Amino acid sequence: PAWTTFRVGLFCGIFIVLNITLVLAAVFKLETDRSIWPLIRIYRGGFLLIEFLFLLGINTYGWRQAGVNHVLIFELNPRSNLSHQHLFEIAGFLGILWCLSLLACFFAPISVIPTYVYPLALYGFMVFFLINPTKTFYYKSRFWLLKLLFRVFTAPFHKVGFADFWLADQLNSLSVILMDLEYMICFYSLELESGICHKYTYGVRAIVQCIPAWLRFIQCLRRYRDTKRAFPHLVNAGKYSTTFFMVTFAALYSTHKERGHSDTMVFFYLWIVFYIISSCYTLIWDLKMDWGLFDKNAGENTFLREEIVYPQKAYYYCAIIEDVILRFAWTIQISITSTTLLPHSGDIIATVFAPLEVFRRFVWNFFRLENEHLNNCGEFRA
Amino acid sequence: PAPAWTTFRVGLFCGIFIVLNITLVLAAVFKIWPLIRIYRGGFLLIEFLFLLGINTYGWRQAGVNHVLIFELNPRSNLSHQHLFEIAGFLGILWCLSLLACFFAPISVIPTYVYPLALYGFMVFFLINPTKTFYYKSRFWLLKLLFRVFTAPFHKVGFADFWLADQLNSLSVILMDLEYMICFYSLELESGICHKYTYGVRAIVQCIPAWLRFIQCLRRYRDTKRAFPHLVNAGKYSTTFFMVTFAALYSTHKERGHSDTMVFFYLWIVFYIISSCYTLIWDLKMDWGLFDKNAGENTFLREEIVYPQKAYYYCAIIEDVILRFAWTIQISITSTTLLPHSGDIIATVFAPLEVFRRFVWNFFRLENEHLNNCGEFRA
Ligand SMILES: CCCCC/C=C\C/C=C\CCCCCCCC(=O)O[C@H](COC(=O)CCCCCCCCCCCCCCC)COP(=O)([O-])OCC[N+](C)(C)C
Ligand SMILES: CCCCC/C=C\C/C=C\CCCCCCCC(=O)O[C@H](COC(=O)CCCCCCCCCCCCCCC)COP(=O)([O-])OCC[N+](C)(C)C
Ligand SMILES: CC(C)CCC[C@@H](C)[C@H]1CC[C@H]2[C@@H]3CC=C4C[C@@H](O)CC[C@]4(C)[C@H]3CC[C@]12C
C-alpha cells in the first residue's frame, strides 16, 4: 500500500541519517581521542549487524515489489513468510538496545554497574534472543536461521544450497563483526601492553579474518565434488583462496616490519600483487558470475544482461560503479583489519569502510537474487 | 493515484528532514551574519510549499475542482505528494546548509557561502532549463510569476491574483532579501540597516500590495465594475498608507521634527483601518461566509463543502487574530518601531501569516468552487 511505502521510506531515511551521524561521530572520536578505540571496536560489530538486518529488510521489500521470487530461491515456506516490516522491527529493536547500551556505558549512570559490562550484556542478550526456546519472538524464522547457520559452519558435512552459500557470502561481508568480536575478547583477556591486541598482529587474527572465506572455499569444494564441474566451483575456490594468500602476506609483511630481516620489501610486493589479484577476482565474479551483467546476448541493454526485472538500468550502472569502488575498499579494509598495517589511520579506514561494505553486499544481494530468479546462475535449483 | 516511488521519496525526505531538524535543535542548544534573517525566507518557502500540498489534498478530498479554477491542465496535475516531496527535499537542503553554518566543517570555504549556495540551488531549481524536476509545473510557475510582476500589462486571471496574494503574504522573504542586500553593501556603524529605516524599505514592503493594486485597477478597467475592484483598490491602498505613515513616524523619531505624535496617531488609525478592511473583505467576500441566504448556518454561507462547520468557525477566529497580527508584523518589519524586538516578533509572526494564508487559500478556493466570487469565469 501507499502508506506502507511511506512508512518504509521514512524508516529508511531515519536509519540512513542516524547511521551516517554515528559513523561521523566515530571517525571524529578517532585521531582526536584516546582509549575510544576499544569502545568503537566493541560497538562496531553490533552497529554493522543492525545495519545488515535493516538493509536485508530493504532487500526483502524490494524483491517483493519488483516481483523477484526470493521465497522460491531460498526455498522458504510460501504459507509462512517474514515480511520486510518484521525485519525492520527486528533491526530497530536491536538498534534501540545498542543505543541504550552505548548511552549507559558513556554516561556511567550507576557506579554499581561497571561501564565495560554494558556492551557484553547487550551482546549476551542478543545471543539469548537468537537462541530462545520460548516462543516470545518469531520462532520459525529464528529456528530456520539457526539451522542454516549450523549447516553453513559445517560446510563439507552438508550439501550446499542457495541459502547456505548466500549466508556464507553475508558472513564474508560481515567478517568485520567476527574480527571485532575477537578483538573484544583479546581486550577483555589482556587489557582488562595497553594496545597489545592491536599493536602486533598474530596468527589467530588472520585465521579469524579468513574464516568466512574458509567456509566459502569448503562449500565450493563440496559443490565441485558433488557436480564434478571444475569451472563453476574451483574458480570460486581460488577466488576465495586469494583472500588467504593476501592475509598471510600482509601478516608476514607486518611481522617483518616489526622485526627487520631484509624480507619486508618482498613481502610488501607479494601483498600488493595478491591484493590486486583478489580485488580483480572478486570484482569479476560479482559483476559477471553473480549479477550476470556484461552478457553478450543483451542487445537492448548495454553492459547488462538481456533480461532485467528492475525498471531502470541506471540502477545497474551505479551498482557496477559502487561495487567496483567498494570491492577495492573492502579488500583494503580486510588487509588492515587482519594485520596491523597502518597504525593510526587503520581504525578510521575500517570504521568508514565496514558500513560501506555492508551496503555493497546489500546491493549485491539485490542483484544476485534478481539474477537467480531470472536464471539459475547458482544451479542450486533444478 | 500518485506513483509509489513518489511516496517512497516523500517518506525518505520527511524522515531525513525530521532527523536534520532534531540535529539542528541539538546543535543550537549545545552551541558576523544574522542567520535567522538569511534562513527565514527559505524556511517560509518550505512551509508554504508544505501547506500548499495540504491545500491540494484538502481540495481533492472536498471535491473543490481547483484545477478548473486555476485553469490547469486536467491531463497533467501536480499531486500533493509531489509538493510534499519537493518541500521535504528543500527542507533537507536548508537544514544541511544551516548545520554547515553552525559547525563550519570546512575552513577554506567561507561560512557565508553556505546560505548563498543554498538559495543558489533554489533559484537554479526554479530556472532549470532541462525538462526535469516537474519542468512543466516549473515553467507554469515562472510564467505566472512573470505575469503577476507585469501586473498592468497582462490581464488578471484567478491564478495571477492568487499568486499576487501569496506574494503579499510572503513579503517577509522580500524584506529579508533587501536586508541581506543592505548588510552586504554597508556592513561588509554596526547594524546600520537595522538601526534606521529608509523609503526603499517601504517600497520593497509595498511591492506585493502594489502589484495587487495594479491588478485590481486593470480588472476595473477591463470589467468596468466599479464596486468590487475599487473596494479592493482601497483595501490595498490602506497598507500603502500604513507603511508610509510608519516610515514617516520612524524618521521623525530618528530626527526630532517635533511632529512625531501626529504621525504616530495617523499610523495607528490607518493601521486599524487597514486591518478592518482586510478582515471584512476576506471574511465577507473572499470566503463567501456570513451569507444572508444561509438559514441553518450562522455567520456561514449557505453551501458548505467541508465536513465540519467548526472548521469554518475556527478559521474565522484565527483569521480575525492573524490579519491584525500580519498588520503589526508589516509595521515592525518595514519600519523601526521596535528595533530591539522587531526582528523576533516579525519572525514569530511570519509562520503565523503563512498559516493564515493557507487557511485563506482553503476557504477562498472553496468559495470559488461554490460561486464565481472572483468573476474570472463566464
Ligand atoms: C558474526 C555475528 C553474526 C553475523 C550475522 C549472522 C546472521 C544474520 C544473517 C541473516 C539473517 C537471515 C536473513 C533472512 C534471509 C532469507 C530471506 C528471508 O527473509 O526469509 C525469512 C527467513 O527469516 C529468517 O531467517 C530470520 C531473519 C533474521 C532475524 C534475526 C534473528 C535475531 C538475531 C540476533 C543476533 C544474534 C547474534 C549475536 C550478536 C553478535 C522467511 O521467514 P519465515 O519466518 O518464513 O522463515 C522460514 C521459517 N519456515 C521455513 C519454518 C517457514
Ligand atoms: C521569493 C519568491 C519565492 C518563489 C515564489 C513562491 C512560491 C513558488 C511555489 C509555488 C507557487 C505556485 C503554486 C500554485 C498552486 C496551484 C495549485 C496546484 O497545486 O496546481 C499545480 C501548480 O503547479 C505549480 O505551479 C508548481 C507548484 C510548486 C512546486 C515547486 C516548484 C519550484 C519552486 C522553487 C522555489 C524557489 C524560489 C527561489 C527564490 C526566488 C498544477 O501542477 P501541473 O504540474 O499541472 O502544473 C501546470 C503545468 N501545466 C500548465 C503544463 C499543466
Ligand atoms: C489557530 C486556531 C484558533 C484555529 C486553527 C484551526 C486550523 C488548524 C483549521 C482551520 C481550517 C482547518 C482545515 C479545514 C479543512 C480541512 C480539509 C479536511 O479534508 C482535512 C482537514 C482540514 C485541512 C482542516 C485542518 C484544520 C484547519 C487548518
Residue with cell 477566529: B317
Name which residue sits closest to atom 25 of ligand 3, judged by CA. Answer: B311
> Do B361 and B55 contact (CB within 8 A), yes or no?
yes
DSSP code for A131: S
The H or E element containing residue A62 is helix A37-66
**Resolution to one decimal, Å:** 3.1
Are B7 and A9 inside 8 Å of each other by CB?
yes
Chain B environment of A14 (Cβ under 8 Å): 15-16, 18-19
What is the distance in A from the centroid of ligand 2 to the CA of B84?
Answer: 12
What b-and-e string marks burial along A339-356, b requiring 16 or more CB atoms within 10 Å of the CB? bbbeeeebbbbbbbbbbb
Q: Cell match 558576523: residue? A: B32
Partner B contacted by A20 (CB < 8 A) = no
B13 at A interface, C-beta within 8 A? yes
Are B7 and A5 in contact (CB < 8 Å)?
yes
For residue A250, what is the enclosing H or E element?
A: helix A230-258
Q: B229 is written with which cell numbers?
A: 475592484
Closest CA to B10 of B61, B93, B84: B84
* B128 interfaces chain A, CB cutoff of 8 Å: no
Q: Is B61 in the pocket of ligand 3 (CB under 6 A)?
A: yes
CA distance B83 to B54: 9
Q: Is A132 in the pocket of ligand 1 (CB under 6 A)?
A: no
How far apart are the CA of B128 and the centre of ligand 2, in A?
Answer: 13
In angstroms, rounded to a whole number, what is the distance separating the alpha carbons of residues A46 and A121?
12
Instruction: Tell me the C-alpha distance between B52 and B84, whole Å.
Output: 9
Instruction: Give A268→chain B minimum CA distance, Å.
Output: 36
Q: Any idea how long chain B is?
A: 378
Q: Which of A6, A13, A21 sits opposite B7 (nearest CB)?
A: A6
Q: Within A174-202, where are the H helices?
A: 175-186, 196-199
Residue A44 is labelled as binding a ligand: no
- Chain B residues whose CB is inside 8 A of the A18 CB are 19
- For residue B265, CA distances in Å to B199, B202, B245, B260, B273 come to 20, 19, 9, 9, 12
Classify each residue of B221-251 as buried b or exposed e, where b means 16 or more C-beta atoms within 10 Å of its C-beta: eeeeeeebbeebbbbbbbbbbbbbbbbbbbb
Residue A141 Cβ contacting ligand 1 at under 6 Å:
yes
Q: Is the CB of B172 under 6 A from ligand 3?
A: no
CA distance A19 to chain B (A): 11
Write the residue in A9, A21, A65 that is nearest to B15 by C-beta.
A9
* 3-state SS assignment for residue A103: helix
End-to-end Cα, chain B, rounded Å: 31
Q: Could you give the angle at which helices A203-227 and A175-186 cross, rounded to 10 degrees?
A: 150
Question: What is d(CA A76, CA A68) in angstroms, rounded to the nearest whole number?
Answer: 14
